[PDB]
Amino acid sequence: QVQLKQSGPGLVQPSQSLSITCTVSGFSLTNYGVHWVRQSPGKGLEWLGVIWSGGNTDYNTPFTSRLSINKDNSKSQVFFKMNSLQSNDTAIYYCARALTYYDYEFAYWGQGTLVTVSAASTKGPSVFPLAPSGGTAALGCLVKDYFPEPVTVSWNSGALTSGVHTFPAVLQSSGLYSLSSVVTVPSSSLGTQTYICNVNHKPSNTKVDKRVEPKS
Amino acid sequence: CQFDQSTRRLKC
Amino acid sequence: DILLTQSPVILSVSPGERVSFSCRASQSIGTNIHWYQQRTNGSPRLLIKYASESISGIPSRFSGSGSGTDFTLSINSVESEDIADYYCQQNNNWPTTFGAGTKLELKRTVAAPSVFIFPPSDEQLKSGTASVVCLLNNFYPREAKVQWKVDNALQSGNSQESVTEQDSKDSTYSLSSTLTLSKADYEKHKVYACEVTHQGLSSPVTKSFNRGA
Known part of the structure; x- marks a missing residue:
């Protein structure tokens, strides 16, 4: 059973950073990359980046300066961090795995994390x-x-x-x-x-x- | 339409 | 980046019909297109990869075709459980990009709402606010009018509505209207009524209660 389970939803204050953990099961991070995708009212579905099985990362160009992805193979955990969030970064954030180690057909998805960017309590x-x-x-x-x-x-x-x-x-x-x-x-x-x-x-x-x- | 994060559906 | 144009924006169809979604790319992408379904409160679900290749676990009524710039997702006999949004994705060019989505809506016969009214709980009243709720259950089409009357005075500006997405089993909607009053205003009036007008109702339906009865 391939599964991806993300940490829970919550509030990020404007200009502060967002951290999400993706814990996987049914496969090894040494064999598959894990991608991150978000879904927002302003821009819909948007691919953000990927950490490959060997540790290399790629980030979509508008995010290269504020995105970092890391992982712990032994814990089956992938760590997503994005800095200096603004109001329009409010979105559902997903981790996802492709069918093949190198490809981008997202056969498996996390459940999504609703991130709200707001100064409120x-x-x-x-x-x-x-x-x-x-x-x-x-x-x-x-x-x-x-x-x-x-x-x-x-x-x-x-x-x-x-x-x-x-x-x-x-x-x-x-x-x-x-x-x-x-x-x-x-x-x-x-x-x-x-x-x-x-x-x-x-x-x-x-x-x-x-x-x-x-x-x- | 516009994506609605409360329902994860397009809102039109 | 590659721009993907999906049409129509809203695809309204009758059950049992063959339905077709269009995804057109701003330049040739070969067959490097994938399709996803998103149901209410769900994550995207991969339906078709590389324009036409099937995915394990996806019903056989889903198929895809096309090469170059014009691509088609097909459902050969649509069901109520197919109510969802549908997205295409290209990966001929980095970065992979997605279309804006097509919303699939399902036609069905007219169904009048069942109407229920709920007074505020005594628990809420000791907070200083009264919420009165009117439920319209399992109706079609979506358009419906809910009017609040308090001692026969039409309320304006103190209610909010919420409507479900179309139900995956019976294709109906439900709606909840909430009238918000201060406790002071609530205690000054007696008759609380929700009046509902809808295409399936030959005349309006009123549900009401008397405060303190």
């Missing part, structure tokens, strides 16, 4: 119930006032997926995000089945498990 969410009261009931969790993105929401520790909708976050006029996650269930299940929304805001290490049930 990290803040964890409050989690409030959206409490129910045709035969189908809707319930949910309101995940309010957090920064930066993202938050993950699951229901019943991932066991409940059918009928779940987790909406895109909205930026409120306060500069903080909010989102809701909802699920529809049989109304006769509200007495005996427990419904828990599991909220994780990794930038602030805030985890909340919130039971949602009809109110008295």
